[PDB]
Curated annotation (Swiss-Prot), chain A:
Residue ranges of coiled coil: 5-49
Functional description taken from the UniProt entry: Subunit of the fusion protein that is processed upon entry into the host cell. Mediates fusion of the virion and cellular membranes by functioning as a class I viral fusion protein. Contains a viral fusion peptide that is unmasked after S2 cleavage. This cleavage can occur at the cell membrane by host TMPRSS2 or during endocytosis by host CSTL. In either case, this triggers an extensive and irreversible conformational change that leads to fusion of the viral envelope with the cellular cytoplasmic membrane, releasing viral genomic RNA into the host cell cytoplasm.
Designated name of the protein: Spike protein S2'
Effect annotated for changing Q10H: In strain: Omicron/BA.1, Omicron/BA.2, Omicron/BA.2.12.1, Omicron/BA.2.75, Omicron/BA.4, Omicron/BA.5, Omicron/BQ.1.1, Omicron/XBB.1.5, Omicron/EG.5.1
Effect of N25K: In strain: Omicron/BA.1, Omicron/BA.2, Omicron/BA.2.12.1, Omicron/BA.2.75, Omicron/BA.4, Omicron/BA.5, Omicron/BQ.1.1, Omicron/XBB.1.5, Omicron/EG.5.1
Native species: Severe acute respiratory syndrome coronavirus 2
Superkingdom per UniProt: Viruses
From Swiss-Prot, chain B:
Name the UniProt record assigns to this protein: Spike protein S1
Region (Disordered): 16-38
Effect ascribed to mutating T44K: In strain: Omicron/BA.1
Quaternary structure note: Binds to host ACE2. RBD also interacts with the N-linked glycan on 'Asn-90' of ACE2. Cleavage of S generates a polybasic C-terminal sequence on S1 that binds to host Neuropilin-1 (NRP1) and Neuropilin-2 (NRP2) receptors. Interacts with host integrin alpha-5/beta-1 (ITGA5:ITGB1) and with ACE2 in complex with integrin alpha-5/beta-1 (ITGA5:ITGB1). May interact via cytoplasmic c-terminus with M protein. May interact (via N-terminus) with host bilirubin and biliverdin, thereby preventing antibody binding to the SARS-CoV-2 spike NTD via an allosteric mechanism.
Top-level lineage group: Viruses
Known role: Attaches the virion to the cell membrane by interacting with host receptor, initiating the infection. The major receptor is host ACE2. When S2/S2' has been cleaved, binding to the receptor triggers direct fusion at the cell membrane. When S2/S2' has not been cleaved, binding to the receptor results in internalization of the virus by endocytosis using host TFRC and GRM2 and leading to fusion of the virion membrane with the host endosomal membrane. Alternatively, may use NRP1/NRP2 and integrin as entry receptors.
Amino acid sequence: LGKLQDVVNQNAQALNTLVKQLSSNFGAISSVLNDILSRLDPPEAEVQI
Amino acid sequence: GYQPYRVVVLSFELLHAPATVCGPKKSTNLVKNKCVNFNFNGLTGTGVL
């Protein structure tokens, strides 16, 4: 039953990747929105966000 | 310019560990099992404990 099985993996893997993309800085000081908001005022938090 | 200027640099290492120094804000009782807004040593969030 490889074919069917393969399908599932292809989907599951994708989702996992997407979720992990929430832990990347992309250049911001942090990957957690709450931390950026609680350490910076909006005038400087806009640039990071 | 020629005359001196006193400088003090305050470096805070926001280590993800117990915090020795914290602000003057007064804590409050602890609530559980109900959707509440929470703060812990500066980590702010919303959820159920």
